[PDB]
């Protein structure tokens with residue numbers, strides 16, 4: 001009924017990602033040494049928010065909520081969750097030679113993202129910021145989503161779906177659950193190519209082009225037909241005909257992963273070697 | 276040793292004085308002269324380092340100016356081969372906070388008209404120096420105009436010709452906050468390519484004047500994406516209040532011409548009566564100095 005001061009419960013250790021997520025810290029549960037991620041927030045209710053981030057983060061593919069705390073003074077609110085210690089999908093691809101992942105790696109991670117999205121969507125929650133930086137790895141190569149569901153800045157636009165970007169015919173630009181699926185496909189091109197489509201454009205020009213351009217495509221024809229088809233489904237231009245999270249889960253590229261165990265094993269090792 | 280066309284190691288030239296936690300800005304000093312500095316520290320990859328060099332080549336030259344917080348240069352503090360280096364962007368230290376701090380520390384988040392005219396003129400003077408040397412500031416706003424302990428008004432400059440503090444680092448991909456952006460910098464149905472022109476700073480100057488007058492830029496009640504959509508489409512913004520002088524309405528009107536091709540120059544705006552005609556100048560300077568001194572205690 002009343003949140004406490006964090007002192008003696010959680011402590012901050014260092015900023016993450018040293019300046020990519022903003023006021024987000026690697027922190028530590030004092031009494032156990034267990035690591036936690038901690039968003040620090042100037043504030044002036046919250047019990048309801050947290051309780052809601054509580055209920056929806058109980059899925060193996062979503063970083064689990066821990067709790068909230070208030071540090072007195074403009075007061076501070078600490079939002080605390082499970083720490084994902086092997087970094088982001090974006091990190092991974094950056095630390096891999098050729099900046100590209102094995103197609104079966106991409107198939108595995110994409111499916112875990114979709115399972116996480118499936119969970120939120122059936123609960124009528126939209127993530128709204130799916131991208132490499134928001135998909136995090138553990139040491140066991142578990143895949144978990146963060147940053148789902150002040151606000152004065154606009155972030156990076158490269159993962160945004162067409163319908164999310166206001167323009168003359170779309171002045172009240174939707175967020176629909178299907179917007180997350182577009183973002184998922186962009187993240188898959190990212191894993192494949194090291195960067196999202198339009199990475200070579202100024203952010204503002206990208207924002208202009210996304211609603212106008214045809215669906216992005218993989219640059220290389222080296223990829224399997226299944227991969228190209230998965231990409232096409234995530235990247236249905238008009239969200240109205242875009243497949244649901246459940247349809248993408250049955251897509252052959254996601255559904256048929258014969259070498260799953262070895263893939264996990266490979267990622268795990270790659271993480272060790274890549275650290 | 277100040278060297279603007281090069282990318283040096285800072286050791287021996289500039290040092291951090293406060294410990295670095297997190298493009299955060301920390302207090303620092305010139306090693307030889309002990310003059311203070313403000314230092315913006317950004318983690319960078321070795322590829323971004325080569326982008327830097329390039330952009331340094333595009334740096335346009337301009338001298339010191341009393342209405343610009345002097346840019347002292349770019350430096351690289353190396354980290355181990357398995358780690359990102361620190362880009363240091365180094366600037367004159369201004370100790371009395373920003374115009375935004377000034378407003379919010381004011382009773383009622385509003386400045387008196389003669390204050391706005393004074394600060395607006397200093398801003399325009401700083402811009403004129405950049406513009407005459409073919410440089411665009413690109414980020415005029417309350418937060419980026421600073422006060423010295425001596426009530427001097429100076430534009431933030433961490434290398435605005437090269438825009439280095441925007442082009443690299445893991446935020447160079449962010450669109451950013453839209454409220455001070457001129458219509459021509461926002462990609463829209465009728466603006467396929469983003470114009471950046473010197474007159475863009477003048478629109479931002481007009482928005483900053485509203486910020487000083489009202490405590491916040493227009494459309495502050497809007498989510499940033501919505502504001503981004505509305506700026507190119509709405510007629511020019513204006514003051515809510517009818518209390519202000521005809522001169523002030525006219526200054527805002529001059530700044531906020533929607534078509535930049537038809538917007539006045541900096542030199543033209545410096546001759547606008549609201550800027551040109553300032554009978555209480557001396558008194559204003561005295562009032563800012565005192566306000567500053569007060570706030571310090």
Ligand SMILES: Cc1c[nH]nc1[C@H]1CCCN(c2ccc3ncnc(N)c3n2)C1
Pocket residue numbers: 016021024025036037038039063079080081082083084085136146147
């Ligand atoms: C900590 C928090 C509380 N509410 N929302 C959050 C988000 C902020 C955005 C990034 N999100 C990250 C970023 C990097 C991370 N790195 C490691 N583990 C994490 N959980 C982690 N989370 C966490």
Ligand SMILES: [Mg+2]
Pocket residue numbers: 057058059060061062063064065
């Ligand atoms: Mg969970």
